[PDB]
Amino acid sequence: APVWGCASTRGRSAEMEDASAAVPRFADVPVRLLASRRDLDALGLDADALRLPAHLFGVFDGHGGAEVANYCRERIHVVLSAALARLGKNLGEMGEVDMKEHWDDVFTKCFQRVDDEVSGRVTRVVNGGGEVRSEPVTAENVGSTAVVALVCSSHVVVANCGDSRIVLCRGKEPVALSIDHKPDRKDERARIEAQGGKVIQWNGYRVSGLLAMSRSIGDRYLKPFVIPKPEVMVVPRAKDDDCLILASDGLWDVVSNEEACKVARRQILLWHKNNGGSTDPAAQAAADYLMRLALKKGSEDNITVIVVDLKP
């Protein structure tokens, strides 16, 4: 049902700490978060009973280790899918509600839940029942970005935590769907300093002079300055839409938004002109191209690219 490609490499680094997830039909989106019950009652349709499939895509740039990025790959889509089914029922005996504010809650409480599992603040289930673990997943200096996009036929919902990024090409011109959580961002400095922390310029603006981002999963040794709260944006799809690009800093450090969009469209069209849970050859070709464009431009970091085609 969903058309995507994923290119991922160790790159010129000794170890791989990037992780990614692409889960088709991972959940059904409660339509009550996309449209009001009254508008649908006027058509005779029951918003609570309406089925709309969604897909999840995620990129997790680990730092200090791969274990938290890997844990995000394995748990976010599961925690999220369960929250959406629970929310779908609680809307039964509920009235109208702020959809913006409910998308914030479900993604925030989801990221917060994976962060709480990673740090040990809650017990977590292994071996699909029977086993439980309560000790932290790993040391307190390991973390990971999380940029995830929930995709259905009518909307793209985006949740970002860290300096990974997702970019939408709408109308052959790029649109940033996330804003990097660099610690020198005016509002992030204000937040960190209000907490009693410091944003120090130390080979780049860093929290406590250490971490080059203001939000992430894990990294409990930098709390409460570094936090897992994501920025959520709900983006109605349009006839203009070209594609979706999720990537780690391994790509965005050497490729601009404009360039990443231009190359993605071209590679998808380029593949269709020459040719009149599995990946799509055209999106894949755009993902492999963007990965190699990052290596050919001198990127020394891990590189992870997901391309999602928004047209056919």
Binding site: E17, G62, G64, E140, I200, W202, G204, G209, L210, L211
Partner: protein, 158 residues
Amino acid sequence: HRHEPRDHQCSSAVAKHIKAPVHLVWSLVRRFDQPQLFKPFVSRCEMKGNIEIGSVREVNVKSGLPATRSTERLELLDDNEHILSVRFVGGDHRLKNYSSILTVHPEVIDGRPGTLVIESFVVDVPEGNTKDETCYFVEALLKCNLKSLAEVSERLVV
């Protein structure tokens, strides 16, 4: 623990109570060739020869930091008086002329034998920063190290 910071330098210290006997803690601190035994930020460490004054370890740190490698020389290692002094003499980091002193002391904690660890340092203030920023940067790392030291120590008692 008396350092004399020069005009172009800062200095501070951090302490930690460990619920383990001195001999147990110090057995971990003294292995100058394996600081990854308690430092969560170390990924690799190389050293030739016996641990002795003048020994040099080449440390590689994990990702997510402002640096990747430092070269460190053992300045002082007293096994009767539990003292360890290290100096950073190379690397690609911004801690020039870093020097630390670490000591372990016996103590009674909750009716059992325990340990107090004290670590102080002096380092040049890098170009563009303040004494306060530099001390904050180091204390955050040291507090984390002594945090890890306490965990591993208290785990060896069981």
